[PDB]
């Protein structure tokens, strides 16, 4: 027996293809192709690639606090006898 922990599995159903030949009405037929299956675009050409400017991805530039603060509480070590 096996146990799998914390792993999501996608179990493919497999096909519903059958081995039946269905006649179709093809008197008139219409075919269209949308640019969806290609993931070429899903609304706009670059939804992923940087949409903001470099300047707008700068989050904070403070002039108050300083990023050099040694931990206010220094861990102390007791003597070893």
């Amino acid at each position: 027996t096996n146990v799998v922990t914390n792993t999501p599995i996608d179990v493919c159903k497999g096909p519903d293809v059958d081995g039946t030949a269905d006649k179709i009405n093809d008197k008139k037929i219409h075919v269209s192709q949308g640019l969806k299956e290609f993931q070429v675009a899903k609304g706009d050409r670059v939804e992923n690639e940087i949409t903001e400017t470099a300047d707008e991805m700068i989050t904070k530039v403070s002039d108050t606090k300083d990023l050099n603060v040694s931990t206010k509480k220094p861990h102390q070590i007791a003597d070893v006898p």
Partner: protein, 150 residues
């Protein structure tokens, strides 16, 4: 353009503020070099015009230079004790030079006559980089050197 960066403009101050701290370090190290020359030259009594510092006319100029090559300084027997032996060797070297330099100088006389407090003890700062401080801070709970120095 009309719209300036919201945050990048503030980098002008950050640049200056970093340079401020750096200038403090350069001035500290440059002053120490100049201090070495003056004390080495044989200037021991106070005088006006020998060194920067308005209190150089008050107290005896004092400077000690010691090179701690820890292999030749530490006494250690076994690895269990190595941390305390490294920390103690460095701190004890400071104590060894600090006590006679604190005696030879007039710091206590200058501080007591300038501040007006009949008995005010100066505090000494251990100015170091991160590597050295990581050793001294772990045993800095006592904060006291000898009898009354903080």
């Amino acid at each position: 353009t009309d719209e300036g960066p919201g945050e990048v403009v503030k980098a002008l101050t950050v640049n200056t503020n970093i340079r401020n701290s750096n200038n403090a370090v350069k001035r500290m190290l440059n002053y120490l070099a100049q201090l070495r020359e003056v004390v080495h030259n044989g200037y021991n009594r106070p005088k006006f015009g020998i060194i920067e510092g308005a209190l150089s006319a008050v107290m005896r100029p004092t400077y000690r230079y010691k090179e701690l090559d820890l292999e030749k300084v530490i006494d250690t027997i076994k690895s269990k004790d190595r941390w305390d032996d490294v920390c103690a060797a460095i701190l004890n070297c400071v104590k060894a030079e600090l006590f006679p330099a604190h005696r030879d100088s007039n710091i206590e006389a200058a501080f007591r006559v300038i501040s007006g407090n009949q008995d005010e003890t100066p505090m000494y700062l251990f100015c170091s980089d991160k590597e050295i401080a990581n050793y001294l801070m772990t045993k800095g709970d006592d904060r006291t050197l000898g009898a009354y120095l903080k």
